[PDB]
Structure formats: structure tokens, C-alpha cells
Design a protein around this ligand. Structure first.
Ligand SMILES: [Cl-]
Ligand SMILES: [Cl-]
Ligand SMILES: [Cl-]
Ligand SMILES: [Cl-]
Ligand SMILES: [Cl-]
Ligand code: NA
Ligand code: NA
Ligand code: NA
Ligand code: NA
Ligand code: NA
Lengths: 310, 310, 310, 310, 310
């Protein structure tokens, strides 16, 4: 039994995160636990303060018409819990439910682990005989609790995009609001834990340039290679899967390339040394001791700018 | 209390994906979150616009007969949410529920990671005293939302196969519709991440052909073999299990074969060298330097065509 | 209010798999999704075709007495969905529910991966004041849909054991039916993927018999041993846990034993060589080159016959 | 509306395992699927066989008072299914529900994998105006079905501790029964699969005592060490986490200790050999060949007795 | 229909843990299973002992007004089970529900594995027309059962912070109580299992200082490095992820640094030895034999005090 007038029905909305948690780099989901507040005018139940004697009349949710507001990108849907319904005398209604759901918002890993992310929660509502339109009420949207935390993330802002995106769908108007939680990573623990050790084992491979022992050099470059892969296995947990070209793992790919040309160089210095041209081998080796770090530092700089300064 | 006439009851159907997600290579399932729209004529509740005054009369789902449409291939069944029921005056009914479920559609991994897939969602309905037949209404079947994404997949099309497959079952006619979501993989991130490093460590093994040091050669070919398996462990996540003959992993099997014959060759060049026939050893080695890459490039071509050009 | 007569109540039963899936080697469970059909005579609701005018009278499940048929070996119990209830005029009732559950059927891994399995679904019903007995109706038991698949299994048959096992339990008769789904594995993908590479790395270890270099030989046999264990880690997923003596893994245990005696032999050839008896060392080595493969092929044959030909 | 008399209300109880499954060494839980039978006198509904004509009067659970029996150590609580309620003429009531839950019973891993375990299921009931006391009825407690199995365990007994533990709690008496399922492990598959290979790779390390090659010896002892850790990773699944001092893993710790002193000995024999005291090196080596196995066999015996014979 | 008077409504509260379990270092959650007791005055249902004849009048929860107490930091919300409602004659009500939930309390890993933790459970209640305030009743808050256990933790205390934190929220007063479970780890099993073996493999690397064999030394330091990473993979389960600077893993980072400078030193002693300055190499080596352990023991002491003595 929807409210009736010549105007489209506006429904004021407001999310308020009590807790957010379980960001899931793999499923691209994150759980949330929040208030939802709806508010809309219904003159059919507008009432008299004086004859009834009360400032506000509460109602059970079964009793009166309530718009079908729905989340769009939510798996584990319909976890709801009505907390309050308060009808104002002029017929404005104030609905307030607690809810929680696992939202599905895609993440972009290209600048990992310096990425920022912007999680989304959509709300549609579908029209009936009246057209229906949602819109954000900022006093009740200010959705961060001070206590919200994503471990390993700094939480920038929770705000709504004030203009609803109205559109046709299966022969009805539908109105969709977009709430956005913005976050950025706590990278620094990764410097001690991921980048530095990989670099150390790479440098250990570069030691081979001061050796002429082909036996010591294969044992060097190849044993550091095994160490490299084993270490990559060790941190496999902090290197989430993407079908796209990540920053980390561009530099990883580049590191495997350095293992390969280190092996090429070692093999060359040895073939050269056995073809009785020791001067060329010692020159290629003495050269590599400068060449390898430098092309690395350069390729690292190109690569950083390509992802960040671009 | 089903509607009655001399004709079989046609029920118009339409799926509309709001979100699809959680494709699961292991369980061969994927979650979906969509509209379902059913529509069918029931003259028993056909009514008068003039005497009742309204263009359309909505009903609670308990109130009137509703066909038992059911998904066939769905674990985590019965996640339903009625959104709209609108009865036209001629007795046509328009049902619209939001639902989500994890569909069970088998995947074919033979051309991984260049595979395309075609996910399926079936709908049966079972006959009563009236025969019953489902059929697809394209205006409400156009099921892709623009926002649907399978991370790492390009989503080609969501369409329904318009002819229902009617058939006897436990002494009743049953009618089954087939909706099909079509997808194809985002392979390219795999070239930097999977294929190139395996190739580099294999080439490092081929370095042994320029060495005559049996000590350096065992250390070479066998340490690169350990590196190879360790790397395979590293990418174990991106190589899903099949009971059948995959393209990748045909080439992987072939790589293990190349490690084996490299070891055979190394051992031969060394036994030959100790039997005082150094010319045969250096000829077998100098030969291997061309033979190995070439049979590889050839075997790779045969293998590519066998899977793709066949 | 159970039906009454001087006879024990027979209830005709019939399972019909629509889908089976998620065979779980670890939990020894598998999910299923099927029809259940019950059928039994109740003269109390037998009725007149002529005075009532209809061939069959349908009933809501709340309305009439329905036997408590129950699955025995089912975790995630009670996922039910009544589809049809049709009462015949003589009082026979035809019940038909769709259901799904995860069945608990033990698997036997001794001949893995050439094993066949025979999954079980039990049905008990418990007596009241009337004795009660289940029995299988083959027209509705023919439970395979053509579309059922267990990925990596060929599905032989779905049949029921026609004689119920009646027995006393907590002072009541109980009757239990046994339905059996029979399957056999798709082994062949395992030959390229598991057996051949293990064999290659073992043969690489046998290469040591053509070397006299103790340095090269320890590096050989022990680096192939590390490769072995790393490879075992790689295929750890396809080697399910058992508390019993599996075929695969008998041969695996035997492979570790071959690494051990290869190390013993290498060490012996070297101690012999340093005790200035080179003729014994070269004889033991030249002997091993035949002895190792042959005792392997023999032990493999004994072992195959012990598990298969026994 | 509880039954009233001058006596405390005794409630006879009885669990009957239909299936037990999913023992979880990690969460320290195990799933169960059983009957529960309650029985208690209620003269308020005692009735006349002659005037009513029936030997037993069944009731719907809503209709009559039923004690709040509750499991204590259960996550995934309240999975219930009433099967029977039968009231005797003198007012004794016989309740029977099927249920399943995941019970939380701590495991003790100190003698793994020769451990036995004793799983617990508690039942409290809380007092009202009448005091209330549970007590076990053995005819309906005999809870094993013949078909119960924990894969890899032998199931000794399912019995109840007949004396309830009554106690004050939040100003009411509460009565708690303790049912106990007793089990012991199937260790033997572990001898081929875990213990023997670790021992083989350790013995391979001991081979170094017959070599004087410091190059061969480091390659030996350290490559077997890497093999060891890799093997430990391989069986990581069968070595469950404890915050306490396990038997296995005492012996593992001891094995790492043997790797360490083998390295110490090897380094010593080599420093001695370069300080031109070859006699002391060859004596320390020739000594180690007996010392290492023996201190091992001894330490293994001490360690076995400390855990088992103590 | 809330109780009315000129005063704010105080609601006495009390949690009582029956079981706590499944502490989850990864999700930073832990499950709990407890009593909740609410108590508050409602004169509207105050009653006469004499005219009604009973000391206490029990009520069904539907029948009377009950405050909306709610947990704040709880995923898997609303697992409730009313156990008792007892109204005193003066109108005080005594509510008692059993519940269980997975609480979300952040953990601090900086002093792992010597950390203590302090888990939190919050309770808000929201005001209506009356202001509403929660407060803790210690006789029913004494929440530890003697049987509570977190495996691997010693459980210090379960207490409540007696002063509620009242505050404005969405135009209502809200009152929030804070219950705190305090725990501290069982570290000692980690000394045999994690710290000692890492130290052993590190010391094995330090053996290289008594060798001048560059072949033996690369094989030494680098093979121990691989061993190190493999071992880190073995204990990866007991080293939970943090975005911050942990104590363990500061020492791990420092260990990787020692591998790196051991490689540097080895390479230097070898380049020095080939530049025909053997005295500098043997001095740097003989120096390292004291320098490495000592800077380690010092760095370990600095690092211990920085985390613990600071
Ligand atoms: Cl050399
Ligand atoms: Cl050589
Ligand atoms: Cl040698
Ligand atoms: Cl030596
Ligand atoms: Cl050297
Ligand atoms: Na890992
Ligand atoms: Na993996
Ligand atoms: Na694995
Ligand atoms: Na593992
Ligand atoms: Na691991």
C-alpha cells in the first residue's frame, strides 16, 4: 500500500559502519557491519499530536508500507535486524536497521603494495505505480565509527555520492546510490619482510663476478636461484593473484631475468676462458660488476615511474 | 489451485545477472546474483479496471498460485526474495524475484590458459494435472548488467536457448530451459608470470652443453631441475587439477622430458670422454646445442597445433 | 494418525540423482542432489472418483500422515523441498520431494589411482504402533540422470539393494534400505603428471653408477633426492591420506629405499676405491648398473600383483 | 508449566551416535550425528487407557512442557529434529530427537601418533521453581551404531558417567551429564610414510664419516639437511600443532640436533686435518661412525620411556 | 511499551563464559559461548505475592518489554537462546539468555610469541523516549567457568569495566559496556620447535670461517641459506601476518642480514686470497669467527630490550 501524491517518492538514506572487516584480496570481497537509515514522507499515517498525546508513534515493520531498498553487490544477502521505526506527525517515517553483509567490490592491484583502494556499496530501489528515488542524508551517512579498522590499512573516508543514478530496467525506473569506503595500504612492514631479503639473495648471485671458478659460479648463481624461488614461495601469501600487470612482480619478473643473464655471463666468461682468450673473459666479468647493479637500478627507476609517475 | 484451459500452460521466464562472482576452478562452481522474472496467464484472477479502479493489482505470494520453477544444477539452493507480483486485468501475472545461488557448471581445461568457458544455469518445472511448459522472454532475459565481472575473464554474452527441452520424468512431463553465460580468459598476465620463468630455468639447464666439466654439469642440470620443481610449486595455484589431457602440462610434461634427456646427454658426453673418444663427446655436445632448442621449438609447435589448430 | 490394518506397512521408495558432486577424498563425503519418491497405501483417505469428480486428489504435506523416512549417513541433514503429493482413489499415496545432502561414505584407497569406489546412501524408517518396512520401486529408483558427472570418475551404476535390512533398535523394529552409486577413477592423466616425472628423477639418480667422481655422485644422488621430495610436495594434492597400506606410496616408499641404497652403493664404491681395491669398486658399480633397474622392475611387479592380482 | 511434586525432577537421558565424523586436530572439534532420548514423569498429563482406549498418547512438542536440556561444549548449536513424543498413562514422557553438532573436546597430542583420545559431550539442564536433575538410562545410552567410524581411529567405547555433576550457577542449581567417546589411533601407516624416510635421510648424513673430502662432506651433511626440511614440509599435514611437548617432534628436535653435531664433527675433522694432526681427525671420524648411531638409539630409548614408560 | 519514570533506565548486565574457543590470529576473531544476564525495574508489571500466591512470576519473552541490548563487535550476530525470565514483585526483571558469537577483537603481535592479549566484547543499547543506560552486576559478571581454555594460552581474567561509555549517536543517547578477557601465550614449546633449529642452521653457516675452500664455502653458506628459507616455510604457520614491526621477524630479518654479510665475507676472503694477500684474508676470517657470534648476541640484546625493556 505505497504513499500517494503527484511527486516521485524520495527516500532519504544513510549508512553507518559500526565495524568493517575481512577484506579478502582473493574473493575481492569484504565484510561490513553497519546501520542503515531510511526516511520518507507518508501522509496516510500522518497523525495528531494533541488527540493522541504523543510526540512520536512507533510501529512494527509488518504494520506499515516500507520501500524495498536493496544492496546490489552483496553475496550473503539479507542479514537484517530492525532497530527502530518512528513516525513523525506530518507523516515522515524514520526507519533504522542494523545489518551486516559481505560486499563485492573489485580491487586494483597494479601498484601493490603502495595501492589505495576504494570499496563500493550500492543501493537500488525499484519503482512501483509511483516512481521511486533514493537520496543521501549526510547527517546519518557520516558512517565511520572511530573504531573501524582494516588491519594493515589506513581508512581515509566513508562518504556517499549524492546524486542517485536513475535508469530504466525491465520496464521500471530504478534509483541507485553509491557509498564509497576509501583505504590505502600499510606498506612499510613489507620493506624488511619482502623486498630486502629478495635483494640480498640477488646480490649474493652477483658475487659470482669476482670469482673465476666456473664450479663455484654455477653453484653460486644456481643455488641463489633456488633460494630465490623458495623465498618467493615463502611470501606467496603476500603476493595476491591478478590477471593484470602488477608493479611488484614486474620487478619480480625482472629479477628472474637478472638470474638468467647472470647465468649467461658466467657461461660466457667460462667459454671465453677455455677458448684461450682470458682477457675478454676478465673484461666481461670486470664490466659486469658495474653493469648489473646499474642496469638494475635503472630498470627499477624506469619501472617505478612507469607505474607511479605515469 | 492451478489455472485451467484446454492448452498447456506457458510460463515466460527471464534471468538478469546483477552480479556474478566466485568462479571456482576446483569445485567447478560459480556464484551468481540475479533477477528471475516469471509471467503466465491466469483467467481465474483476471479482473475489471473500471469497477475496481486500478490499472494493476498486486498480490502477496501466499495469496495466489505460483508455478514451481526450480534450478537444476544448484548447490546452496532456495536463496529467494520476492520483489514484485503484478496481475494484469486479462489474468497475465508478472512475478519478479531476486535470488542468488552457486551454480554447478563443468569447466573444460584442455586449452588452459587460452580456454573459453560456457557456464550453464538450467530451469525445470514439473507438470501437475495441466501440462506445463517454460519459455524465454527476451526483453527480460537480457541478463547482463554492465557492471558484471569475473576477475580475469572477459564476459562475452548472456543469452538463453529459446527452445525448452520437454521430457518425461517419473510419470510427468517436465520442461527445462538453458541459460548460458559465456566467458574467455585473460591469459596475458601469465606470460611474464608463468611461461617465461620456466623457459629461463630450462635454458639455464641447456647451458651445460658449453661445459665439459661433469661436476659443473651435474650441478647445473640437476640444480636447475630442483629450481624447476620449486617454481612449479610456486605457480601450483594457477594450474588447476583436471583428470584429462591439458595443453599446459602437456608442455610441462615435455619439459620434464627435456631435463631427463639433458641428463642422459651429459652422462653420455662424460662416459664417452672417459672411454677415450673425446671427438664423439664433443660432437654430441656441439650437436646438442642446436638439437635441444630445435626439437623443443618443433615439439612446441606440434603440441600447439594438436590442441588449437585441431 | 498412521494408517491401520493387520499387515506391516510397506513404503515404496525411490531415489533419483539429478546431480552428484563434490566428492571429497579428505572428509570421505560427497554431495548429492536428487529426487526422493515415497509411495504407500492409506485407506483412511481413499476416495470416490465419481462423487468428487477428479482422477487424483493432491494434498498439502501438513494435511495427512507421512512416514518419517530418514537418511542415516548424512551430515548437513534435512535439506528438503516437497514437489508433489498425489493420492490415488484406493488410498495409495505418491510423495515426491527434491532434496540434497552431503552423504558420508567411506572410501578405500588401497588401489589408488586405479581404485573403484561404491558410494552408499542409507534410508531408515522407525516403527510406531504399526510395524513399518521400506522397499525399493525400480521404475522410480532408476536414479541416474544422463547429466550426472563426478569430474575424474566414470559413473558405472546407480542401483538399490532390494531387500531391506529390518532390525530391532531401542525397542522398535526399524527398516533400512541401501542405495549404491558405483564409480571408477580416470587414472590416465596421472601417468604424464605423476608417475613419469618421479621415474625420471629416480633414473637421474641412477646415472651415478657411470661416474666415479664421489663429489659428482653425492651431488647427484642427494640433489636428485631433494628434487624427489620437492616433487612429492608438488603432487601432495593428488595423494590423499589413508591410515592403511596404499598401492601408490608402497611404490613411493620403495623409491625412498632406492635412494638410500644408491647412497650406500656410492659410498661403498668410494670407500673401496680409497682402500686401494679399485677392481671391487668398479665391479660393484658395473653390477649396480644392471642390478638397480632390474630389482626395481621386479619389485614393481611383485608389488603390482600383491595389490591387484591378489 | 513444569510438573509439580515435593521431589526434585529426574530426567532420564540417552545419547545414541548414528554417525561420527570430521575429527579436526586443528580446531579440536569433531562432528557427531545422533539420537537424544529424554524421559521424565508428568502426572499432570497422566491419563486413562480405558476411557480413551489407547495404550500410548503422542503429543506435538509445542503442546506440553519439555525440559531445556542443552549441550555445553557445542559450536554450531541447535541443530534439532523431533522424531517421537510418547506419553505413558502414569505420566512418564518419552522424548526422542535426532540432532547433530560439532562438539568441542580438547585433544592431547603428547604421545602422537600412538595417542588415545577421549572425546566429551556435556549436557546441562537449569533449574526453575522445581530443582532439576539429569541422569543416564543405559538401555538408550548404548550409543554406538556398529557403523560408526573415525577414519584412522579405532573406536573403543561410547559410555556415560552415571553420576551427574550438580552445582550452583547464577542463583540456580544446574545438573550436568558427561558422555565419553573413546578412541585410539591407527599409527602403522606412519611407519612406512613418516618415520622411515626421515631416518633414511639422517643415515645418509652419517655417510660423511667414511669420507675425508671436506667438499663432499659439506655437500653431504648440508644437502641432506635441506632434504630433511623439505621432507618435514611434505609431512607437515600429519604433524598437528600443539603448545606443548609432543613425543614426535621431541625426536624431530633431536634429529636437527644430530644434523648440527654432524656438521660440527665434519668441520672438526677438517680443521684437525689442516692443522697437521691427521691421526686425531681419523680417530674422531672412526669414533663417530659408532658414536652417532649409538647415542641416537640411546636417546631414542630415553625419549621413548620418558613419554610412554613414565 | 517501555517502563516509565522521571529517572534514566538502568539495566544491570552480566556475561558468563561457558566456553571460549577458536582464537583466530588471521581474522583477528575468536568464538565465545556464554550466558548473558539482564536485570531492570518495571513497575508496570510489579505484582502482589499474596493475591497471586507465588514468589516469582515467569513470562514468555514475547509477552513483555525487553531492552534491545546488542553486541557491537560481532560478526555471525544474533545467535540467541532465552533460558529464563523471572519477574520480582517490585517489578525488577531478571533475564538470562545463552548465546554464542564470534567476537572481533584486534590482536597486537609486536612481542610475539611472548605477547599477552586483551580480547574485548562490547555491549551497546540505544535510547528511546526514556534515556537508557547499561551497568555491570559483578555477582553475575564473574564470567569464567573453571573449564574455559584457549589451547596455548593461559587465561588471566574475565572482568568488566564498570563505567559505561554513554554518547550521542544519530540523535540518541547510547550506552556501551566493555567486557575484557585477558590472556598470555604459552611460548615455551616454540624454543625447541622454532628458535633453536633456526639458530642451528645459522651456526652451520658460520662454520665457513674455518674453511678456506671457496667451493666448500659457497656450498656451505648458500646451502644453509636454502635450508633457512625452507625451514621458514616449515614454520610459516606459527608466524602470523602483521602490517607492523614484530619482535620475531625483526630477529628473522636480522638473520637474513647475517647470511648476506657471511656471503660478503666469504667472497672477500677469496678475492683477497687470489690477489695474493693471504695474510689479510686469514686475518678477516680469524676475526669473523669472533665477530659474527658477538655482533649477533649484541644485536639480539639490543633488539630484545628495544621491544621488551622499552
Ligand atoms: Cl673452476
Ligand atoms: Cl669434471
Ligand atoms: Cl671425486
Ligand atoms: Cl677435502
Ligand atoms: Cl677452493
Ligand atoms: Na605458502
Ligand atoms: Na602452492
Ligand atoms: Na601442496
Ligand atoms: Na603442506
Ligand atoms: Na606451508
Amino acid at each position: 500500500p505505497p504513499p500517494i501524491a503527484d511527486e516521485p517518492l524520495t527516500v532519504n538514506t544513510g549508512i553507518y559502519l559500526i565495524e568493517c572487516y575481512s577484506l579478502d584480496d582473493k574473493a575481492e570481497t569484504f565484510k561490513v557491519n553497519a546501520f542503515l537509515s531510511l526516511s520518507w514522507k507518508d501522509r496516510r499515517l500522518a497523525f495528531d499530536p494533541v488527540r493522541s498525546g504523543v510526540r512520536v508513534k512507533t510501529y512494527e515493520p509488518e504494520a506499515i508500507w516500507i520501500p524495498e531498498i536493496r544492496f546490489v553487490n552483496v553475496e550473503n544477502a539479507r542479514d537484517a535486524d530492525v532497530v527502530d521505526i518512528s513516525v513523525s506527525p506530518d507523516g515522515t517515517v524514520q526507519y533504522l536497521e542494523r545489518f551486516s553483509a559481505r560486499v563485492l567490490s573489485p580491487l586494483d592491484f597494479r601498484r601493490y603494495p603502495f595501492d589505495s583502494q576504494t570499496l563500493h556499496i550500492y543501493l537500488i530501489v525499484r519503482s512501483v505505480d509511483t516512481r521511486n528515488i533514493v537520496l543521501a542524508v549526510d547527517l546519518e551517512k557520516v558512517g565511520k565509527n572511530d573504531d573501524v579498522f582494516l588491519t594493515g590499512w589506513d581508512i581515509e573516508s566513508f562518504t556517499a555520492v549524492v546524486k542517485p543514478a536513475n535508469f530504466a530496467l525491465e520496464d521500471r525506473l530504478e534509483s541507485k546510490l553509491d557509498y564509497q569506503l576509501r583505504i590505502s595500504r600499510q606498506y612499510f612492514s613489507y620493506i624488511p619482510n619482502i623486498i630486502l631479503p629478495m635483494l640480498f639473495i640477488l646480490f649474493i648471485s652477483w658475487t659470482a663476478f669476482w670469482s673465476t671458478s666456473y664450479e663455484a659460479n654455477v653453484t653460486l648463481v644456481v643455488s641463489t636461484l633456488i633460494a630465490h624461488i623458495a623465498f618467493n614461495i615463502l611470501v606467496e601469501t603476500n603476493l595476491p593473484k591478478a590477471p593484470y600487470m602488477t608493479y611488484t612482480g614486474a620487478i619480480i619478473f625482472m629479477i628472474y631475468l637478472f638470474y638468467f643473464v647472470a647465468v649467461i655471463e658466467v657461461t660466457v666468461q667460462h667459454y671465453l676462458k677455455v677458448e684461450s682468450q682470458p682477457a675478454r673473459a676478465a673484461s666481461i666479468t670486470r664490466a659486469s660488476r658495474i653493469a648489473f647493479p646499474v642496469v638494475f637500478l635503472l630498470a627499477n627507476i624506469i619501472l617505478a615511474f612507469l607505474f607511479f609517475g605515469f
